[PDB]
């Protein structure tokens, strides 16, 4: 399959309750592999997957340092967003960063990211070309100016194209047994009468990895997008995910409906009905 590696920063100011909290999580696809949290008793990069444990002592010291430096920078950043947006020092604010790389099956770059958000709205994003920025407003334009001035996009591209893809390839190899295994969903259709004359068919998918899945109800072979109730894909706790789609159908009509399952662990897309 295709793969990705992402790092997600969250920096959260908390006036009156100490210095902003800085949190870093690193994911290969939908597996968390590494974490850093400035509130930990001893703030350090910590392994969250077995296959990253086999990284040497230097790795952890280098990676912790990056994260301790970033803690400061991202705290510098919140103070800056305060000036740039003429806000007061009494409110709690959030800066987030997602950056990383997608690789094709062959293992080379498909796309790279480096974007930030301030209080849950877009601030600045590295464009697909990895040499230009999209600033969201006049505040983030100041950052853009600064970032062009100091050849940042260029450094991202050297990373996104070199280290990102190379470490991602080493990770997928060391964690081959899990990272390159797709677990198919276990599927069944449940039948819950509601009125005398209306029933709930719910299509389940359980125990699948990765998270990406398509679940669709059809009536006489037609999409029922607007009659279908769809829950967000949810983690089980054992690395796997769950999802359901549901339709409310009239009684005696359960056989006009079919559930459609698409997922990367399945050779064929599944068609399933309600069975007695």
């Amino acid at each position: 399959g295709s793969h990705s590696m992402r790092y997600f920063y969250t920096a959260m100011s908390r006036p009156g309750r100490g210095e902003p909290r800085f949190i870093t999580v690193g994911y290969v696809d939908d597996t968390l592999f590494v974490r850093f949290d400035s509130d930990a008793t001893s703030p350090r990069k910590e392994p969250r997957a077995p296959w990253i444990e086999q990284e040497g002592p230097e790795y952890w010291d280098r990676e912790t340092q990056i994260s301790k430096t970033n803690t400061q920078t991202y705290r510098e950043n919140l103070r800056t967003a305060l000036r740039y947006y003429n806000q007061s020092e009494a409110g709690s604010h959030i800066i987030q960063r997602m950056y990383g790389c997608d690789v094709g099956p062959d293992g080379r770059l498909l796309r790279g990211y480096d974007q930030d958000a301030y209080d849950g709205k877009d601030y600045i994003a590295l464009n697909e070309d990895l040499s230009s920025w999209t600033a969201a407003d006049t505040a983030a334009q100041i950052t853009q100016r600064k970032w062009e001035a100091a050849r940042v996009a260029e450094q991202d591209r050297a990373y996104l194209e070199g280290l990102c893809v190379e470490s991602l390839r080493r990770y997928l190899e060391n964690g081959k047994e899990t990272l390159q295994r797709a677990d198919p969903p276990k599927t069944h259709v449940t039948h819950h009468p509601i009125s005398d004359h209306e029933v709930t068919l719910r299509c389940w998918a359980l125990g699948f990895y990765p998270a990406e899945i398509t679940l669709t109800w059809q009536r006489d072979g037609e999409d029922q997008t607007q009659d279908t109730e769809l829950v967000e894909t949810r983690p089980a706790g054992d690395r796997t995910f769950q999802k359901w789609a549901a339709v409310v159908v009239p009684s005696g009509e359960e056989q006009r409906y079919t559930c459609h399952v698409q997922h990367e662990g399945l050779p064929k897309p599944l068609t399933l009905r309600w069975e007695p």
């Binding site: 690193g26 990676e63 920078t73 970032w147 940042v152 990102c164």
Partner: peptide, 9 residues
């Protein structure tokens, strides 16, 4: 592996 130190806003 992470990129080096991130840059100021």
């Amino acid at each position: 592996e992470e990129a080096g130190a991130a840059f100021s806003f």
